[PDB]
Amino acid sequence: PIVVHQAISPRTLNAWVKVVEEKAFSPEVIPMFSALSEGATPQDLNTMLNAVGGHQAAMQMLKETINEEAAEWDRLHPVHAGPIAPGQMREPRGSDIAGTTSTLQEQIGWMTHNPPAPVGEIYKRWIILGLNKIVRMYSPTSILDIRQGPKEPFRDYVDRFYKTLRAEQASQEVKNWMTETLLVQNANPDCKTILKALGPGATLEEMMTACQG
Amino acid sequence: PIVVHQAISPRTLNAWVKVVEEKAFSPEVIPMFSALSEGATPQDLNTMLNAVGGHQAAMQMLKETINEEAAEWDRLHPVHAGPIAPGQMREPRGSDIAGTTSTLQEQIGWMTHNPPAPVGEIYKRWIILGLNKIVRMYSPTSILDIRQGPKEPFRDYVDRFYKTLRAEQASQEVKNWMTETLLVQNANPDCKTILKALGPGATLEEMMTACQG
Amino acid sequence: PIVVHQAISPRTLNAWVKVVEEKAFSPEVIPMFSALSEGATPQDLNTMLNAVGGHQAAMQMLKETINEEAAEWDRLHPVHAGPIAPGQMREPRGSDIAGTTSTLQEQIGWMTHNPPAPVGEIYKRWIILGLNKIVRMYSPTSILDIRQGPKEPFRDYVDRFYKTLRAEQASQEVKNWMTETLLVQNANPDCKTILKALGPGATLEEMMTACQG
Amino acid sequence: PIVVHQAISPRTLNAWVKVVEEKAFSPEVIPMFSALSEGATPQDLNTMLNAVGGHQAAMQMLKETINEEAAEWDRLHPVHAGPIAPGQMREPRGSDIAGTTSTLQEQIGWMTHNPPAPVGEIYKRWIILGLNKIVRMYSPTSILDIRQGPKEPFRDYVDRFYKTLRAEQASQEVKNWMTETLLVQNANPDCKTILKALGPGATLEEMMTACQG
Amino acid sequence: PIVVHQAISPRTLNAWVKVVEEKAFSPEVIPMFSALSEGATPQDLNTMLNAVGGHQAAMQMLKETINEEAAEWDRLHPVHAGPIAPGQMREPRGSDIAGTTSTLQEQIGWMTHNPPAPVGEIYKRWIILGLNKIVRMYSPTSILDIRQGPKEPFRDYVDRFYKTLRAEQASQEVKNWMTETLLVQNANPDCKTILKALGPGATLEEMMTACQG
Amino acid sequence: PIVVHQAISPRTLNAWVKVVEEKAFSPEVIPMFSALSEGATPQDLNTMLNAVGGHQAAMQMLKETINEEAAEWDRLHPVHAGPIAPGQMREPRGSDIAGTTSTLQEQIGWMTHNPPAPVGEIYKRWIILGLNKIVRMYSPTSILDIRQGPKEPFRDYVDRFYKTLRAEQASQEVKNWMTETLLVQNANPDCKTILKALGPGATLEEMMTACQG
Ligand SMILES: [Cl-]
Ligand SMILES: [Cl-]
Ligand SMILES: [Cl-]
Ligand SMILES: [Cl-]
Ligand SMILES: [Cl-]
Ligand SMILES: [Cl-]
Ligand SMILES: [Cl-]
Ligand SMILES: [Cl-]
Ligand SMILES: [Cl-]
Ligand SMILES: [Cl-]
Ligand SMILES: [Cl-]
Ligand SMILES: [Cl-]
Ligand SMILES: [Cl-]
Ligand SMILES: [Cl-]
Ligand SMILES: [Cl-]
Ligand SMILES: [Cl-]
Ligand SMILES: [Cl-]
Ligand SMILES: [Cl-]
Ligand SMILES: [Cl-]
Ligand SMILES: [Cl-]
Ligand SMILES: [Cl-]
Ligand SMILES: [Cl-]
Ligand SMILES: [Cl-]
Ligand SMILES: [Cl-]
Ligand SMILES: [Cl-]
Ligand SMILES: [Cl-]
Ligand SMILES: [Cl-]
Ligand SMILES: [Cl-]
Ligand SMILES: [Cl-]
Ligand SMILES: [Cl-]
Ligand SMILES: [Cl-]
Ligand SMILES: [Cl-]
Ligand SMILES: [Cl-]
Ligand SMILES: [Cl-]
Ligand SMILES: [Cl-]
Ligand SMILES: [Cl-]
Ligand SMILES: [Cl-]
Ligand SMILES: [Cl-]
Ligand SMILES: [Cl-]
Ligand SMILES: [Cl-]
Ligand SMILES: [Cl-]
Ligand SMILES: [Cl-]
Ligand SMILES: [Cl-]
Ligand SMILES: [Cl-]
Ligand SMILES: [Cl-]
Ligand SMILES: [Cl-]
Ligand SMILES: [Cl-]
Ligand SMILES: [Cl-]
Ligand SMILES: [Cl-]
Ligand SMILES: [Cl-]
Ligand SMILES: [Cl-]
Ligand SMILES: [Cl-]
Ligand SMILES: [Cl-]
Ligand SMILES: [Cl-]
């Protein structure tokens, strides 16, 4: 990464590979990825993705997404040809941002320029976009099917609900609505009755303490 | 964290994730969290919370608490609109402090300003507030139910008492009173008799050495 | 490596040796190698290759490849004899680049000169060239033999396809064609029918969600 | 710690928690604590104590001891009220030293002042005082009960003797006397006879080599 | 090591001790040794050798070799007596290079002088010379006895051949000849026939792909 | 240690404690100790010794030895009383060197003075002196009892011989003589005959290759 440049740390790299081995594509993999790639160059970012053995269906989807974002980038930032002046960098293309048509030193040039052409953070955006698609698609459950069982402690139901929620394809307002409707609606008869009695203004803290017994 | 800024360390992060895997929400998780987040930016803080897979009931309660503290913040610090001058930062909102409507560079701007707008320490406060609620709620036992058994070594009873005490929803003065009343009151007849004989001025050292035999 | 020079880290080195123990010569070994050798001197690079115990058939092929690239280098950069002036370095030969006829201090001299004679990155190129040959040759499967099974979840077939693809001796355009033809062509009758119905413009995301059920 | 200030390291912290898990309160825990807390702020010190889950009987005794030392401190250093001048720090109270009524920045202010108000080393003193009480109290054996067995190799007896000795509540002169009297006195008849014959000027080296056979 | 001087790292040291525990004296131990001792002082080097428990037959041979190289050094660099001037170092003897009659500060003096008396790299040379003798002597197999078995995959034969080759006492030209003669000559009848048909100009890549089936 | 001062590293410390757990007092423990204590203050040194749980017979012998060396030090360096001038340090006593009557800052004062009063290296000397006594005394075997068995590979006999040799109480010249006499003298009849035939000028390399078959 950049803090000029240093090599991606072996411990960071192995951390990233361990995460993908164990967790597959659970939601928490994405903040984990962001943390391990803070200040990363496109090179470092490619290193991280390429280091993954297996899950090549997902890694291929991630390439396709990256190439979409690259094409969009080109479309919005059309190249202006000419001799690049002394003390200046060329305008990065879609592929320069994703690291396949740029050198490390060009990447360092962009990231440390005044003002910066922040290509790592652009590429990280695109990567995370692709990671989000995969997480969603690889989620086994649907939020509409999370139903508290007759003798299931409320806390375990809430744990399943919000896990499934975190992997859903939905904006914040749509998630807010799933909480407004489904959580209470899909509780078991006893808890459901008690939570209806608390009203629709009640906090999760309130609801959980209410169905403790 | 800030010491300007560096990436949250992979070892720090994995430390934090390991703690939540093993300890769940035992009281000691909170000082552990403070230690691993010393100098953290809101981004780093979010990284740490988001890295947690599972316990999404608790992580959701923690969001709700954070949003309460954010609303309170807004209420007390009402926004003053206008063009921000050169060499100045905008006044942070509730959501800017919690990292969802601020960039990392805005966070770095606030934390390193003269005088600092110490947004990490504010957000850490709010997080720990939420962590304290969860610990309490997830405590299995009540302090009123800790009773020394007939053949239970006094030290093991004191160990259960003060563990349960540490997870209670009570100020220092209320805790002081639980010690004043319950510890001696809920000892077994033999130890109880011996500790009554020491009087109410006796130290824990004194009490433990007294019921050693 | 160079960041002047420091010793290759013991953790980096053991990382590299662990990778070759576990993964043998799976495709992901090569980005792993690049990451662990960022800024490496030819010495450091030789250290990494020499540290490998076993796989001496492959390590011998890698030597042969290195010596080919060295001979090519000599051919294109013919030596110009004469006394090297003060404040100057000799032109590196093929073997100087590969570290067998150069000292560490000569390597440091080249890598830190203005402009640099970037001998580490040249030698890394040649090494990776040799690593790519070995990966291909040591691949057990051929892309033409990857056929989805009658009850095989489409995702597992796509996982086998793109794993085998990544180890193939083929340019990007030839890979693009294997995707254009073989993926859909070698699916099982049910999925094959559904993917034919999507047409040849369909994304992998689209194709996978289509054959989910 | 301070070396200005950096966060307590995650490895240091986990080291400390591991020590208390494994060793409980064996004597060697205290030098271990001193090592892991070199240059610590009161905050760092509290972090270390608070990180301990379990042993809350002992952790409570340690609080009581800390509060005693704090009260003594107040008694000897009575507060002098007034506006603190520019370029000056307030006189630390007992609780400021123990970190509960001081900020980290006040602690850093004291520890880095010219001359320093060395609050970490004061609090560490008090902590170690409390740790010493606990070790003693939690020692299972008494030095008066360590008796060499009939077929016990002298070296194993000396190992038990000096282990039990290290956990005793006794000054150096009292320990010197336990060595003068008990070691030889409580040896088995054969070794006891041989060590009486060496006289009271003999070194431990001499005594051990004497009872080797 | 020197990068002035720092202590040999505990991780480096334990790395070195682990290598000798596991690998004994396989060829790869020597590049491993060079890597872990980059910039080492004679002291550091002695530390590494002395840290080895066991294999004292080999460690004794290594001493004998070191003392030979030391005697040779003395012979070629005969001592010139006299008062050493201010701003000057004495000429190092054989034993000064090997660290037994020099202080660390004398070693640092030599290694950092302008021009350097590079005593670490001299002693490392001598050590590696001794390590090479041991590897050879401790090799179980002879290159003349490596014969492909009737149903042995060619790749496994080539793996045994080049492993045994790497431990041989032979210059490059002699190794080149063992490849020219023995590899093909000692293949099984089927592979042997196919490799004879490729001719004596064929690469290892070519030969291995030829005997794949 | 000093490189001014930093805290002994947790990894160094745990390294040292692990060594004493596993190896007990095998000869290699002493170079291990020197490595882990390079640049150590007396405080750091005491930390390392005090961190050892168990082996208190040996740790007590080590104290006795330290106190002997301290008394000798006092004897040779008799204290000269008077007011210590500005810009000066008091002359260290035996106990100041061993860290029990000196502060860390006094130790840092001595070690960094121009010229240095190198108290760490003095105390390390004394410690290693004591460690050497213990190793010798705790050695199970005597060099006079190492006899090659009738079917024992010569290399294993040489391994036992030089291990036992390394733990002996003997100068270099006395060790040289044990090699001159005992090694060949205590070989089995077959090897003994062959080594007599090589003569008394033969190297260990020569002797081992001679008794290979
Ligand atoms: Cl690392
Ligand atoms: Cl994987
Ligand atoms: Cl998955
Ligand atoms: Cl790749
Ligand atoms: Cl796969
Ligand atoms: Cl450019
Ligand atoms: Cl942008
Ligand atoms: Cl479900
Ligand atoms: Cl409802
Ligand atoms: Cl790290
Ligand atoms: Cl978890
Ligand atoms: Cl829980
Ligand atoms: Cl997230
Ligand atoms: Cl869960
Ligand atoms: Cl702003
Ligand atoms: Cl505030
Ligand atoms: Cl209970
Ligand atoms: Cl009562
Ligand atoms: Cl390292
Ligand atoms: Cl291997
Ligand atoms: Cl393989
Ligand atoms: Cl090699
Ligand atoms: Cl092999
Ligand atoms: Cl040159
Ligand atoms: Cl080039
Ligand atoms: Cl297949
Ligand atoms: Cl088709
Ligand atoms: Cl760390
Ligand atoms: Cl514990
Ligand atoms: Cl205990
Ligand atoms: Cl706490
Ligand atoms: Cl407990
Ligand atoms: Cl103040
Ligand atoms: Cl004080
Ligand atoms: Cl006992
Ligand atoms: Cl007696
Ligand atoms: Cl380390
Ligand atoms: Cl070993
Ligand atoms: Cl061996
Ligand atoms: Cl040694
Ligand atoms: Cl051995
Ligand atoms: Cl000199
Ligand atoms: Cl030389
Ligand atoms: Cl063989
Ligand atoms: Cl032939
Ligand atoms: Cl560390
Ligand atoms: Cl131990
Ligand atoms: Cl032992
Ligand atoms: Cl101690
Ligand atoms: Cl013991
Ligand atoms: Cl002084
Ligand atoms: Cl001295
Ligand atoms: Cl024996
Ligand atoms: Cl003889």
What is the rounded CA–CA span in Å between residue F75 and residue D148?
38
Resolution of the experimental model, in Å, one decimal: 2.6
Cα E156–Cα C27–Cα C202 angle in degrees, nearest 5:
135
Residues whose CB falls within 8 Å of the CB of residue E5, separated by 6 or more in sequence, listed in order: E41, E104, E108
- Return the bridge partners of C2, or none: C5
**Tokens coding A172:** 């914040």
Q: Give the CA dihedral E72, E77, E82, E86, nearest 10 degrees.
A: -110
C-alpha to C-alpha distance for D162 and D175, rounded to whole angstroms = 10
CA distance B26 to B22: 10
DSSP 8-state code for residue A2: B
Let me know: does F139 contact F129? Beta carbons within 8 Å.
Answer: no
Q: Number of C-alpha atoms within 13 angstroms, CB side, residue E49? A: 26
β-partners of residue A5 are A2
Contact state of D56 with B203 under an 8 Å Cβ cutoff:
no
Nearest CA in chain A to C160: A56
User: What are the structure tokens assigned to E129, written together?
Assistant: 């010379």
Q: How far is the C-alpha of F99 from the C-alpha of F93, rounded, in Å? A: 10
Query: What is the number of residues in chain F?
Result: 213
Q: B10: which residues sit within 8 A by CB, 6+ positions away?
A: A9, A11, A12, A15, A35, A36
Q: Is A52 helix (H, G, I), strand (E, B) or coil?
A: coil
Cα E66 from chain centroid? 14
**Running DSSP on this structure, what letter comes out for residue E143?**
G
Tokens of D35: 């090592």
Q: Can you tell me whether residue E154 is helix, strand or coil?
A: helix
| CA torsion, ordered A86, A92, A93, A98, to nearest 10 deg | 140
How many Cβ atoms are within 10 Å of A192's Cβ, its own excluded? 16
Within 8 A by CB and 6+ apart from D138, the residues are D24, D25, D58
Which chains contact A through at least 3 pairs of Cβ atoms less than 8 Å apart?
B, C
Name the DSSP class of A144: G
- Which residues in chain B have Cβ-Cβ distances shorter than 8 Å to D13? 15, 32, 35-36
Q: How far is CA B190 from the centre of its chain?
A: 37
Of B151, B148, B149, B145, the residue nearest B164 (C-alpha)? B145
Q: Please enumerate in sequence order all residues whose Cβ is within 8 A of that of B203, keeping only pairs 6 or more positions apart, or say none.
A: D61, D64
* DSSP helix/strand/coil, A161: helix
Torsion, Cα A80 A83 A85 A88, to 10 degrees, reads 50
Task: Indicate the SS3 state at residue D152.
Answer: coil
Question: Token pair of E80, please?
Answer: 């010139």
CA pair distance C63, A126, nearest whole angstrom: 39
Of C51, C55, C133, the CB nearest to E159: C55
Contact call for D159 and F8, based on CB within 8 A:
no
- Distance between alpha carbon C135 and the CA centroid of its chain, in Å? 8
Task: Please name the residue that has the structure tokens 């879609």.
Answer: A94
- Both ends of chain B: CA-CA distance in Å? 51
Measured CA to CA, the distance from residue B111 to residue B134 in angstroms comes to 28
Residue E75, both tokens: 């012979």
Please give the Cα distance from D81 to D90 (Å, whole number): 9
For D96-134, b where at least 16 C-beta lie within 10 A, e where not — what string?
bbbbeebebebbbbbbeeeeebebbbbbbebbbebbbbb
CA distance C131 to C137: 10
Cβ < 5 A residues, ion ligand 3? A 24, 138
Contact between C65 and C130 under an 8 Å Cβ cutoff? The reply is yes
Handedness of CA A57, A61, A64, A70 (dihedral sign): negative
Query: What is the DSSP code (8-state) at residue C179?
Result: I
Find tokens 């596993």 and name the residue. Answer: F22
Residue showing tokens 């304290």: B132
Query: Taking the alpha carbons of E96, E102, E104, E106 in that order, is the dihedral positive or negative?
Result: negative
- Among candidate residues F39, A35, C59, A102, the one with its CA nearest the CA of residue E204: C59
**Cβ pair D3, D38 in contact under 8 A:** no
Whether residue F115 is preceded by a cis peptide bond, meaning omega within 30 degrees of 0, is: yes
Q: A69: which residues sit within 8 A by CB, 6+ positions away?
A: A94, A125, A126, A129
**Residue C154: strand pairing partners:** none
Q: What share of chain B is helix, strand, coil (3-state, %, to 5)?
A: 60, 0, 40
CB within 8 Å of D203: residues ≥ 6 apart: F61, F64
A52 closest CB neighbour out of C28, C204, C208? C28
Task: Show the DSSP H helices in chain F as ranges.
Answer: 10-23, 29-36, 42-50, 56-76, 94-97, 104-111, 119-138, 154-166, 172-178, 184-185, 189-198, 204-210
Residue B101: partners with Cβ closer than 8 Å, 6 or more residues away: B93, B95
Chains B and F touch (3+ CB pairs under 8 A): no
- Tell me how far apart the alpha carbons of residues C128 and C125 are, in angstroms, rounded to a whole number: 5
By the CB criterion, residues less than 5 angstroms from ion ligand 44 are E 141
Please choose, from the candidates E208, E213, E151, E212, the residue with its C-alpha nearest in 3D space to the C-alpha of residue E184.
E208
CA of B29 to the centre of ligand 3 (A): 30
Q: How far is the CA of A90 from the centre of ligand 6 (A)?
A: 4
Tell me which residue of F157, F158, F153, F175 sits closest to F166, measured CA to CA: F175
Cα A139 to Cα C115: distance, rounded to the nearest angstrom: 52
Query: Cβ–Cβ contacts within 10 Å for residue C21, how many?
Result: 12
Tokens linked to E158: 């080539």
Give the Cα separation of C185 and F95 in Å (integer): 85
Going from the C-alpha of D86 to that of each of D83, D89, D90, E20, the distances in angstroms are: 9, 9, 11, 62
Asked whether the CA dihedral F94, F96, F100, F101 is positive or negative, the reply is: positive
Q: Is the dihedral of CA A186, A191, A194, A199 positive or negative?
A: negative
In order of E106, E116, E130, E156, the CA distances from E40 in angstroms are 14, 14, 17, 38
State how far the Cα of D57 lies from the Cα of D137, in Å rounded to an integer: 12
**Eight-class DSSP state of E131:** H
Token digits for B156? 């093991």
Tokens of F194: 């062959």
Q: Give the SS3 label for residue A55.
A: coil
In this structure, which amino acid lies at residue E205?
E
Helix (H) or strand (E) holding B12: helix B10-23
If we measure between CA atoms, which residue out of E22, E21, E17 comes closest to residue E33? E17
For an interface test with E, the pick among F18, F33, F34 (most E C-beta atoms closer than 10 Å) comes out as: F34
Euclidean distance between the first and final Cα of chain D, in Å? Answer: 51
Query: Environment class of residue A141 by beta-carbon count within 10 Å: exposed (0-12), middle (13-18) or buried (19+)?
Result: middle
D45 vs D33: CA distance, rounded Å: 10
Helices (runs of H) and strands (runs of E) counted in chain A: 12, 0
Q: Give me the half-sphere count of Cα atoms (radius 13 Å) on the Cβ side of residue E198.
A: 18
Which fold is adopted by the domain D143-213? 1.10.1200
Of residues D36, B143, C29, the one with CA closest to residue A53: C29
**D-chain residues within 8 Å CB-CB of F61?**
203-205, 208
- Please list every residue in chain D whose beta carbon sits closer than 8 Å to the beta carbon of residue B39: 7
Q: Hey, what are D44's tokens?
A: 């760092």
* N-term to C-term CA, chain A: 51
State yes or no: cis peptide before B115, omega within 30 of 0. Answer: yes
Q: Do E51 and F34 touch (CB under 8 A)?
A: no
The CA distance from F97 to F89, in Å, is 13
| Measured distance CA(D125)–CA(D104) in Å, rounded | 19
- Rounded to 5°, the CA angle A192-A194-A196 comes to 65
What Cα–Cα distance (Å) separates residue B155 from each residue in B68, B149, D16, D91, E149? 41, 12, 23, 38, 70
Q: Report the C-alpha gap between E89 and E82 in whole angstroms.
A: 12
**Distance of CA B152 to CAs B159, B165, D61, F164, Å?**
11, 19, 20, 53
The b-or-e profile of B114-125 (16+ CB within 10 A means b, else e) is: eeebebbbbbbe
Q: How far is CA C175 from CA A179, C165, C181, D175, in A?
A: 46, 7, 10, 81
CATH number of D1-142: 3.40.50.10190, 1.10.3470.10, 1.10.10.60, 1.10.375.10?
1.10.375.10
Q: How is chain C split into domains, by residue range?
A: 1-142, 143-213
Count of helix runs (H) and strand runs (E) in chain C: 12, 0
Q: Which of B9, B22, B32 to mutate to test the interface with D (most CBs of D within 10 A)?
A: B32
Q: In whole angstroms, what is the distance from residue F178 CA to residue F161 CA? A: 10
CA dihedral B168, B174, B180, B182 (to 10 degrees): -40
